[PDB]
Design a protein around this ligand. Sequence first.
Ligand code: BCL
Ligand code: BCL
Ligand SMILES: CC[C@H]1c2cc3[nH]c4c(c3C)C(=O)[C@H](C(=O)OC)c4c3nc(cc4[nH]c(cc(n2)[C@@H]1C)c(C(C)=O)c4C)[C@@H](C)[C@@H]3CCC(=O)OC/C=C(\C)CCC[C@@H](C)CCC[C@@H](C)CCCC(C)C
Ligand SMILES: CC(C)C/C=C/[C@H](C)C/C=C/[C@@H](C)CCC[C@H](C)CCCC[C@@H](C)CCC[C@H](C)CCC[C@@H](C)CCCC(C)(C)O
Ligand SMILES: CCCCCCCCCCCCO[C@@H]1O[C@H](CO)[C@@H](O[C@H]2O[C@H](CO)[C@@H](O)[C@H](O)[C@H]2O)[C@H](O)[C@H]1O
Ligand SMILES: CCCCCCCCCCCCO[C@@H]1O[C@H](CO)[C@@H](O[C@H]2O[C@H](CO)[C@@H](O)[C@H](O)[C@H]2O)[C@H](O)[C@H]1O
Ligand SMILES: [Fe+3]
Lengths: 47, 47, 48, 48, 47, 94, 251, 299, 45, 46, 46, 46, 40, 276
Amino acid sequence: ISGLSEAEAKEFHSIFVTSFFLFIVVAVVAHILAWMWRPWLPKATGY
Amino acid sequence: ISGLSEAEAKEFHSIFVTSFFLFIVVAVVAHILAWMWRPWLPKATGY
Amino acid sequence: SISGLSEAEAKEFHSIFVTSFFLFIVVAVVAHILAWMWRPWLPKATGY
Amino acid sequence: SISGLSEAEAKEFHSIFVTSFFLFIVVAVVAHILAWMWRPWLPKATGY
Amino acid sequence: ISGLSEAEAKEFHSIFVTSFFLFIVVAVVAHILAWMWRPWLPKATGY
Amino acid sequence: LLLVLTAIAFVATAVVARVLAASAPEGKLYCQAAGAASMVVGPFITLVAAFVLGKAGIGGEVLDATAMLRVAALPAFGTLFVGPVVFWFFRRQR
Amino acid sequence: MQPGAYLDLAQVTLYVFWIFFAGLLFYLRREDKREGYPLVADAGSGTRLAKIGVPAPPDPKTYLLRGGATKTVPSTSNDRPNVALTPAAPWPGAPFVPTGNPFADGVGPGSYAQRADVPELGLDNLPIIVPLRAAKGMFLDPRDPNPVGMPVVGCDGVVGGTVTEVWVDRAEVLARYLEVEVAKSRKRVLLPVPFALINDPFGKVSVDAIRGDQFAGVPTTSKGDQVSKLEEDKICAYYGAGTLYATPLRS
Amino acid sequence: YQNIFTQVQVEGPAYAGVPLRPGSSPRETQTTFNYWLGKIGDAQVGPVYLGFTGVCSLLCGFVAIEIIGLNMLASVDWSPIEFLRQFCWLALEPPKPEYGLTIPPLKEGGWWLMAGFFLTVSIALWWVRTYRRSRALGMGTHVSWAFASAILLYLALGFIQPLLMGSWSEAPPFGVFPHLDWTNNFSIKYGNLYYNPFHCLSIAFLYGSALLFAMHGATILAVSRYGGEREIEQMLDRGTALERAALFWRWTMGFNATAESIHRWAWWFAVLCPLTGAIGIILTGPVVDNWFDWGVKHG
Amino acid sequence: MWRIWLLFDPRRALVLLFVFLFGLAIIIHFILLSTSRFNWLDGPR
Amino acid sequence: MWRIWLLFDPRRALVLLFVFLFGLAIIIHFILLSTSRFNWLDGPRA
Amino acid sequence: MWRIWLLFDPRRALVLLFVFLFGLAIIIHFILLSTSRFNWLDGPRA
Amino acid sequence: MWRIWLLFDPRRALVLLFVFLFGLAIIIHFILLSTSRFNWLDGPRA
Amino acid sequence: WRIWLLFDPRRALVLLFVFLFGLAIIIHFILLSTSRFNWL
Amino acid sequence: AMLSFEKKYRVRGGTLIGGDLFDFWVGPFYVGIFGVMTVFFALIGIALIAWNTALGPTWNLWQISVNPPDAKYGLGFAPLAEGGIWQWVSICATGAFVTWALREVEICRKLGIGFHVPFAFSFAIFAYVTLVVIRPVLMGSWSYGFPYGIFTHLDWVSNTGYSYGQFHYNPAHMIAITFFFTTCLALALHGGLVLSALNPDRGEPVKSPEHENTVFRDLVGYSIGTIGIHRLGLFLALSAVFFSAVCMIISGPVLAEGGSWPDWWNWWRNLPIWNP
Ligand code: BCL
Ligand code: BCL
Ligand SMILES: CC[C@H]1c2cc3[nH]c4c(c3C)C(=O)[C@H](C(=O)OC)c4c3nc(cc4[nH]c(cc(n2)[C@@H]1C)c(C(C)=O)c4C)[C@@H](C)[C@@H]3CCC(=O)OC/C=C(\C)CCC[C@@H](C)CCC[C@@H](C)CCCC(C)C
Ligand SMILES: CC(C)C/C=C/[C@H](C)C/C=C/[C@@H](C)CCC[C@H](C)CCCC[C@@H](C)CCC[C@H](C)CCC[C@@H](C)CCCC(C)(C)O
Ligand SMILES: CCCCCCCCCCCCO[C@@H]1O[C@H](CO)[C@@H](O[C@H]2O[C@H](CO)[C@@H](O)[C@H](O)[C@H]2O)[C@H](O)[C@H]1O
Ligand SMILES: CCCCCCCCCCCCO[C@@H]1O[C@H](CO)[C@@H](O[C@H]2O[C@H](CO)[C@@H](O)[C@H](O)[C@H]2O)[C@H](O)[C@H]1O
Ligand SMILES: [Fe+3]
């Protein structure tokens, strides 16, 4: 046990999921910009 | 209640958010000036 | 109850602190203006 | 107070402190004038 | 403070300032001798 | 030669250290300018001795300021030590 | 990475180690904080929130003892928080001055911990520190001197009492305490062996921590053939106090 | 007085030790007392429990030692005079490079291979013995896992790095001065081992173990007058001795350990010395062949 | 899935997750910076 | 989001954040100063 | 913003600020002295 | 500014300030003496 | 005398003496560092 | 602040010099006069190192190096830009180490414990002094001290070792290595033993010193006990460092610099018992 009631657990988890999702959205935008700057994953013959 | 009260937490968080935002905008100005000085993100061949 | 002080003490210390910090920053700005007059930094991508 | 000085004693000590600090600063200033008269610093970008 | 009276402060201060100025006189004479031996602070070229 | 001859420094330092060891007025003045002055009065004694006996050539030779300094260095350094140990007889009295 | 790249297996392994070792230092510094926390804030510090440090102390750790008993560390009951001391100055970091008698207060070099008032039971559920009269089968090994009989003398040269019995540790054969019949009050007090020079310099055993009369004030054990951990700290602390507070006018 | 020696040494019966779980055999009954041992420490010299794993460990180890010694005697024409003369210079040399990882002729590394096999089996059996002797008393197995680190360095030196290089010839010989020369030539052949970072780390942890054990021994001897040497009891029930030790180190360097976590520090430093050593050896040759070139490539 | 916070203290879990995320971001940035194609400071040479 | 201050001591979190920010700032500054292009003191030849 | 001194001991904060500012000033001065263009003692060859 | 002595004891603050100032003076004197232009004892390297 | 209300001289004097001696030693060693003022 | 049990011990007195002027704490740290002096020396040394680096080519932490004077200066003071910074960093370092040992002595007196820790630190101080003072003086020039650099003093160790053929054959050096390896072995053994007794197998009570004695017997053959182990550890570390210092004193002052340690052992091979 972590000494946390299920009300506290659900509250923390909802806020955590929201934060994790915003972090994922920011990271996705970052990777789209990075790909526009330099694509990775070349072909087997190189870029 | 790992130390604080609801009111203190809200006050601290408001001040934290506003000063974090001031830090962000000062850093954005700093990066605009830095980019005006020397842009990063070269082309795949160089600058 | 707070982490140490009262709002009166906090405000007094903050007044003195902001005054000292402002004059410190002003001295630093004068120093940087003089330093730039002596040697500018931030060269072009080719050099000075 | 934290240091244990009454504001009377704090003011009394601060008077002598600023007097000594300013005498120190004046001596340092004449020393720097003399040092500059012996060897100026801050050269040009090409050297002295 | 220090367990030293104002009158005792002054009476020690007497001999203190005397021996301090004796030390200063001896140092000044030593410096005059050292300078007559070999002066310092040359010019930007040399001695 | 002057070097081993300049034991004038050591004996004169012993003399002045004995003097101020007897003349140290109160207690805890050993920790004061009795042992300290017994340390630094020595090199000045040997300086003036070398100055007086280098002009008057004793080692069959007359010395300059530089040669006299090079010669009288080591007596000065040993005197810096012989001062305090001779003075220590102050506390060794009482 | 590839043979020509700047990144290679050796430095990747080194950075893996650096990460593991930073984690390990954090874990070790965290284990270090199982006693003595939270911190006691000093003068001029707000005492509302606890001071702990950047590796916060871990949750209390529970040890299982032999007789089904259980001990949870930190041992907060051992702290003796409030003692007979007063700050020598109002500013933080100032030392404290013993208000009373530092031998009786247990302050400074004379401090002790509020240990359990029960002896150590070792393995057979019997006290391990016992007088030789109570541990049959053991003997002083006459290869070394025998303390018993020698009258113990203080630090100022005054005889303090007479050594009556040697207290030893069982299962770790070792002399821990000398029993001392005090001078002329018919009382027996313990003397830790490390605080005594049992060599017979002249004729006797000498203790330089306290002076001759102070042997009357050594904290006495409640039982007669066993000593508790609390009395152990009290005795060693009474003798340690002399390292700073006795100096028996031997100038 | 300080506790470098025991002034008065008491003597009593011999301790048989803690009874074991129902999974072992009756131990020996030597239980003799040496006076000088008790002068510097405790005096009892037994009873050494020697069960199956201990006996097979000694048998395999003495097979290996017999092979090594008979080879050093044969390499000198069986002359005991020349054996005493050349002893520190004699060695059972590893196989020749031409044989790779095969079983070479006996005089060209077969004897070396057999001695290494039997020494490894001896060491693994001794490790199993440490594990069982700890868990037969109900204790943790921290000593066994500290021994496993030394075993990992020894395996990397003699087995793993020779494997990854594809040749038994990479391994040390069985001789005093010859294995010193092997160490030297290993450093010389692979660049300069001072630029192996895990070598630097292993040296850091060896110096740190020496430093830490000086610190800890000195600390326990300094508070031994307050009962500081009884570390388990001072951890279960904190006394003034461990408080004074913690305060000494906290006032000296700002941070301290407890009576138990100092031994975690000790364990981990001593273990990380051969762990980083084994990593740095496994990297030397299969991954990096010139350590000075690598260091120049980085710094 | 909220039950994970009954298993792990949210404070320790959150600090550990943040340390992990920052370390991973630093490692990826340094890996990219050590390559020639993805070095954004000096460039491909 | 303000609830995160019911978990973490704000003084300790804030000094941690300041130490981390200063460390990151000096690290990025030193990295830039080690490159040739973004060195702003000696210039582009480095 | 005066509320910061309801969080932190202004005395310890003042000493920490002094130590940090002095360390930073020393670092920057030494950085400049190590360069060639901004070395103000010997000059432009360093 | 006199209020600074309600925070810090003047004896220890003064002694620590003196130690700091002496150390700074020692360092600046060494730095000057290590250069060629400001070596007031031997002069330039020539 | 005002300095003697602080720093009771019964201990603020031997410290000054060792400081003066240390400074004298430092200056002598700095002089021996040079060639013009190396009097040996 | 203080540990929850510390207030009892933070008493006045026990210093060597200065009285109560420096008898105070700064956070965890006790100051004393020697604490001020130690920070002074350490900071002057670090600033001189930083200045020497500012005069140098690189700021790379691994390549920073404060080099000793040239051999042309012998045992005299070198100019500050030609080795004098090394001498002054050495003086600052020896001052820092000595005042650190003295501050430890003051703390020992204030706590009422033995002086084993400053005494043991004096051995490391002595090894350092052997390396930078005693050995180069016996060999006649400060150029024999090692450079203060993370990887240049390793180059110094390498060159010094290889100047005597193979340094492994240095006998005092073999003894010192034996002592270091035994110190690491004993540290692992002691740490693991105490951790085994305190953290036993599942469901088991915390074990006693008797179990520790039993398992130590079964491993090493006999028992030294709880005080014997700490004595032996102190002795092993101190003798390792002492024989390292001896090792360095005998190579260069005693065995010539271009000598051979492998060849020194021929005295045994050439005994008349077996030589002809
Ligand atoms: C291309 C390079 C450009 C440049 C481009 C940028 C860009 C882009 C940015 C900056 C930013 C900054 N630049 Mg810039 N900058 C340049 C040159 C400089 C120089 C110099 C000497 O040349 C300096 C001093 C600075 C300084 C700064 C800071 C004002 C600011 C860093 C944020 C920060 O301080 O976080 C630290 C914040 C804190 C709150 C830390 C507080 C520390 C507290 C007090 C506790 C620390 C304890 C400490 C560990 C104790 C030990 C101290 C030691 C003894 C030192 N720049 C050059 C010309 N600069 C950033 C900015 O403006 O952000 C707002 C930013 O985004
Ligand atoms: C010219 C020589 C090279 C050098 C070449 C090497 C090589 C090669 C190695 C080291 C290794 C090490 N070096 Mg080195 N090293 C150099 C210079 C140094 C200097 C110095 C001051 O210059 C120091 C302090 C060190 C120190 C160290 C250690 C940190 C490390 C050994 C770890 C250990 O504890 O092994 C002790 C533990 C073991 C040796 C394994 C334990 C053995 C088993 C478990 C016990 C079996 C006993 C058996 C049963 C008894 C009977 C057997 C029969 C009689 C045969 N080196 C120079 C650069 N060094 C080792 C390492 O790990 O580095 C990466 C290593 O392989
Ligand atoms: C933490 C890393 C350090 C470490 C740890 C360590 N070593 C260990 C252990 C641990 C935790 C044990 O539990 C185990 C042990 O039983 O210790 C008493 C052991 C051990 N480490 C040993 C040796 C050893 N450890 C070394 C190193 C180290 N050990 C590291 C520095 C070295 C070095 C530096 O070379 C040696 C030689 C043994 C004493 C023992 C393992 C015994 C073993 O495996 O026995 C096998 C049986 C035989 C080979 C039969 C013959 C036995 C005799 C030849 C024993 C002689 C012992 C010793 C005197 C040899 C010395 C070298 C010889 C060439 C003279
Ligand atoms: C099918 C195969 C492939 C499987 C095998 C694979 C194995 C897994 C191989 C593993 C081998 C590796 C692991 C070994 C690692 C080597 C060690 C690192 C050795 C380094 C150090 C050795 C010396 C320091 C000690 C030498 C012994 C001593 C000098 C001589 C003793 C002999 C005499 C004195 C005995 C007197 C006796 C008389 C003759 C009298 O009767
Ligand atoms: C007991 C410890 C753990 C068990 C052992 C750990 C290792 C187990 C996996 C070993 C895998 C084999 O590892 C592989 O060995 C082969 C031959 O042996 C090497 O193969 C090659 O090695 C070198 C390369 O120059 C040459 O000798 C030769 O060309 C070839 O043999 C590989 O480079 C190595 O990757
Ligand atoms: C009040 C404080 C007064 C302080 C006074 C200062 C006293 C002088 C300090 C001692 C300085 C001696 O300085 C140095 O000493 C050594 C030790 O013999 C001399 O002697 C050395 O000469 C050469 C190199 O010069 C060495 O190879 C030789 O082995 C050694 O004899 C040095 O040539 C000299 O430069
Ligand atoms: Fe221990």
